[PDB]
């Protein structure tokens, strides 16, 4: 499933 990068993106990513 989600690797560590996908999890970090799910936690913090914000569209700008």
């Amino acid at each position, epitope marked *: 499933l989600r690797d*560590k990068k996908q*999890k*970090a993106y799910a*936690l*913090f990513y*914000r569209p*700008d």
Partner: antibody, heavy 126, light 113 residues
Framework: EVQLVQSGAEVKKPGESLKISCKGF????????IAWVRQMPGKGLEWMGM????????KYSPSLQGQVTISGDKSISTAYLQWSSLKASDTAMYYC???????????????????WGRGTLVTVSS | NFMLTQPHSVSESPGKTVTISCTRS????????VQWYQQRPGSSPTTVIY?????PSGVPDRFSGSIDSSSNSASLTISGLKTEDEADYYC???????????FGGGTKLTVLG
């Protein structure tokens, strides 16, 4: 140049409200998460929550049970940690930290706490 | 939901290497990123390791991070121990069910003088 300035120490009593601040200088405050870390005297770090000020999107620790509020005012680039009713247990140092995000050699983003305030010491004694 | 257990204390003489280990109670230590923070006396914490093994600019390479999935642990290794490294070290990871940050209890590193 970039800095986080936290409000000075507070010595209050049980039942008093409180609101401590964390202002960012030298960068776009609204585009980075601000996290709050509690450290009771002589003990370890505890994560209490996060706020993205751009949209004031908030995350909390499961163990706060509504006692505290995490807010922001991006017109003045400030984050806030707020107690409606203080308790003796709330005695601790409270740091705010910026979650930096850059690009790594792979082209993906990474996050970590690069910038810390000096911490607000909150004593709550009768 | 998980815990991160850390030894209370470790010590070593200057110049040699120390390792601080951080065991996760449940789930794989390799399923979520691991950060390590340093906190000297009377100072605010700083990140010495992030994303298991990445070092922020200004942190020397004598600090290194690793993951052992067999033991379900993360490790911080400090080579060429200097007296300025005496401090509390904390491991930290994420719980995705609630997006919570889990911290270890902290380990006091003393440089034997």
């Amino acid at each position: 140049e970039v800095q986080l300035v936290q409000s000075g120490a507070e010595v209050k009593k049980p039942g008093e409200s409180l609101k401590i601040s964390c202002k960012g200088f030298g960068y776009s405050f609204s585009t980075y998460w601000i996290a709050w870390v509690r450290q009771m005297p002589g003990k370890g770090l505890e994560w209490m929550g996060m706020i993205y000020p751009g949209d004031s999107d908030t995350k909390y620790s499961p163990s706060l049970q509504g006692q505290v509020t995490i807010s922001g005012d991006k017109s003045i680039s400030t984050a806030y940690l707020q107690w409606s009713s203080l308790k003796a247990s709330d005695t601790a140092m409270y740091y705010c930290a910026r979650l930096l995000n850059n690009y790594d050699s792979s082209g993906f983003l990474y996050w970590y706490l690069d910038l810390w305030g000096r911490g607000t010491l909150v004593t709550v004694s009768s | 939901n998980f815990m991160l257990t850390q030894p209370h204390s470790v010590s070593e003489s200057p110049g040699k290497t120390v390792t601080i280990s951080c065991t996760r109670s449940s789930g794989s230590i390799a399923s979520d990123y691991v950060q390590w923070y340093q906190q000297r006396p009377g100072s605010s914490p700083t990140t010495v390791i992030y994303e298991d093994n990445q070092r922020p600019s200004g942190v020397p390479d004598r600090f290194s991070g690793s993951i052992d999935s067999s033991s379900n642990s993360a490790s911080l290794t400090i080579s060429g121990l200097k007296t300025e490294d005496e401090a509390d070290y904390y491991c930290q990871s994420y719980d995705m069910t609630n997006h919570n940050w889990v911290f270890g209890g902290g380990t006091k590193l003393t440089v034997l003088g």
